Design a protein around this nucleic acid. Structure first.
Ligand SMILES: [Mg+2]
Ligand SMILES: [Mg+2]
Ligand SMILES: [Mg+2]
Lengths: 67, 105, 131, 46, 104, 57
RNA sequence: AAAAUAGACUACGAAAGUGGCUUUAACAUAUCUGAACACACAAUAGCUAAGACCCAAACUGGGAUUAGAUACCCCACUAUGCUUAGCAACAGUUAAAUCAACAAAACUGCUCGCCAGAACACUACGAGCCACAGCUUAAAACUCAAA
């Protein structure tokens, strides 16, 4: 899980608010949940990922979240 | 150790982008670094408007500079990036490849 | 004194053909481009060669004393800059206490090795106060 | 093996000699670090 | 005006009983400003009190040794050389002067 | 009840059950024993049970 | 300045405590018990010096209200909230009748500290501050058959 892979990290945020999903929604084991969380924050603060919304270019990727 | 510099440069014409890239890599080598690769991720619209050097940016070029630097270099390089006017945002991280995959089986 | 920055890392010092190598790879494989922990490992390896009879045996009391001594040197170097780091102050004071305990045990068990340790690491053993 | 890998790798490093040429080559190339994951755990290359 | 008795305080210079409370009383009021003149009779025990008060926070010490801390001066208009040490003004005079032993 | 393991050791009957009365030559007994190690078990027991009797006599 | 989501996580730290990102240092110890008196921390009161003052706010003023108004609403502004510097443990057991009750199922071993009626009772002979009239500061006797 890399902070530059914004496509993968956008598969774990809310399309309308940009909030990160929890493990009850994502289904990840807690360690990979922590990796995804830290990567998302790193990307957001380093100017790679939007924070208040999901980047529209990635709205049509496979839905891996149970929401 | 091994570091990665993620660089967000100002949306400029090719000669000036080349000049800025040469300048930053020259600074890296001046502070004792061995630059390994330089990769261009592309020119793209910023996720959000970024204010730097009294100018508002909505577009920027993304570059990656892989290098090996002595540990004391990092801080100095950060200061230099704070002074270069063509850089919206530079961040130095420990290279992801050094962090070896944990054995989660 | 610290090891020279040009010294190779402990793990890249016995690899065959390391002397037939380009200068750039030597720099990549030196203490110049590693964090402080490799320099401390090199210090420990040097002291183990200089003091103990069997440098490979690491479970001996003398080995533990040398390791704690290099750790204590690291803590003092750290606290020289972060004067208000109370956690590392606690760690330094504790580590000094256990090194004193190990020195007492070594003195009571092996006096020759005790003298060698005290000379090699520049440690002045002092008897505890009575009250 | 690590040392030999570095023997081969150090050849293609950006020195101060081939600086400008590699800078221009980077400006004439684009790399992509984006890939997607499916519910089947398969990497969907862009 | 006429002689006015402000306080009556029992002390014992040998055991230092009441000396510290005396210092506190002297350093707490507006009216105890200025020079102190330690009058008394011969066997009153003046010298012991002078030695006690000399080695205390009451004195503005510049050195530790009691030889230099106290100075000898001739009494004005006479040749009677007597000891003296400099004292502090009481506390109220910083928010908003010499000691003297006289012949017994 | 009486405190400690094996309180019978602290009874004059046990203390006088000792049968070692040293000749007049013996002045000092030093007893070197190891707290751990099976080979010294008896020695440890010697310290626990019979030293009080030897000293009493 | 302080850190929504993750966090339905329960990790790090001796404790208090720590949850924005990056980088640099960095997370003692191969048996246990053992400090009022040693060294580090930590918290809780109360005063003392200076300093900041957006906002809030005991006290203190002002405005409106029944028929002792709203103690309660509104305005203004203090102390203060801020910033410095100071004053039972440890190892093993679940076998037994577990089992005064109530809590929190009972146990052993080993060590330290502490406990032998009400009574951590009451009382100012006095002492300090004060300076004629007030404030602060106590143990013991004594008594009882209770508590
Ligand atoms: Mg202990
Ligand atoms: Mg206000
Ligand atoms: Mg204890």
């Amino acid at each position: 899980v890399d902070y530059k892979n914004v496509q993968l990290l956008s598969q774990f945020v809310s399309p309308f608010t940009g909030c990160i999903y929890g493990r009850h929604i994502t289904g990840l084991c807690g360690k990979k949940q922590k990796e995804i969380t830290k990567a998302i924050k790193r990307a957001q603060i380093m100017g790679f990922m939007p924070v208040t919304y999901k980047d529209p270019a990635y709205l049509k990727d496979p839905k891996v979240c149970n929401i | 150790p091994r570091y990665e510099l993620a660089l967000i440069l100002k949306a400029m014409q090719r000669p000036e982008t080349a000049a800025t890239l040469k300048r930053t890599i020259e600074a890296l080598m001046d502070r004792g670094a061995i630059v390994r690769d330089l990769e261009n991720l592309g020119e793209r619209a910023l996720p959000y408007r970024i204010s730097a050097h009294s100018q508002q940016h909505n577009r920027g070029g993304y570059f990656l500079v892989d290098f090996y630097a002595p540990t004391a270099a990092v801080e100095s390089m950060v200061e230099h990036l704070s002074r270069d006017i063509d850089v919206i945002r530079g961040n130095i991280v420990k290279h992801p490849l050094t962090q070896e995959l944990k054995e989660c089986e | 004194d610290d090891p020279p920055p040009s010294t190779l890392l402990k793990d890249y010092q016995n690899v065959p053909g390391i002397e037939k190598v380009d200068d750039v790879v030597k720099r990549l494989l030196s203490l110049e481009m590693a964090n402080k922990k490799e320099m401390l490992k090199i210090k420990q390896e040097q002291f183990m060669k200089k003091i103990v009879a069997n440098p490979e045996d690491t479970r001996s009391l003398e080995a533990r004393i040398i390791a704690l001594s290099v750790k204590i040197r690291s803590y003092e170097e750290h606290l020289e800059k972060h004067r208000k780091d109370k956690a590392h102050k606690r760690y330094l004071l504790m580590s000094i206490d256990q090194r004193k305990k190990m020195l007492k045990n070594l003195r009571n068990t092996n006096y020759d090795v005790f003298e060698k340790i005290c000379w090699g690491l520049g440690i002045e053993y002092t008897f505890p106060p009575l009250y | 093996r690590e040392v030999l890998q570095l023997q081969e790798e150090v050849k293609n490093f950006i020195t101060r000699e081939n600086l400008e040429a590699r800078v221009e080559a980077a400006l004439d190339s684009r790399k992509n670090y984006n890939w997607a994951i499916t519910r089947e755990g398969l990497v969907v290359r862009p | 005006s006429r002689t006015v008795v402000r306080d009556v305080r029992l002390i014992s210079a040998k055991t230092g009983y009441g000396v510290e409370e005396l210092i506190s009383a002297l350093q707490r009021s507006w009216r105890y400003r200025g020079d102190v003149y330690l009058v008394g009779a011969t066997n009153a025990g003046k010298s012991t009190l002078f030695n006690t008060l000399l080695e205390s926070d009451y004195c503005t010490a510049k050195g530790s040794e009691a030889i230099d801390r106290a100075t000898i001066s001739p009494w004005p208009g006479t040749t009677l050389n007597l000891l003296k040490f400099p004292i502090c003004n009481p506390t109220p005079y910083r928010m908003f002067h010499w000691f003297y032993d006289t012949p017994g | 009840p009486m405190k400690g393991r094996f309180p019978i050791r602290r009874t004059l009957q046990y203390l006088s059950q000792g049968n070692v009365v040293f000749k007049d030559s013996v002045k000092v007994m030093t007893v070197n024993y190891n707290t751990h190690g099976e080979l010294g078990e008896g020695a440890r027991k010697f310290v626990f049970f019979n030293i009080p009797q030897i000293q009493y006599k």
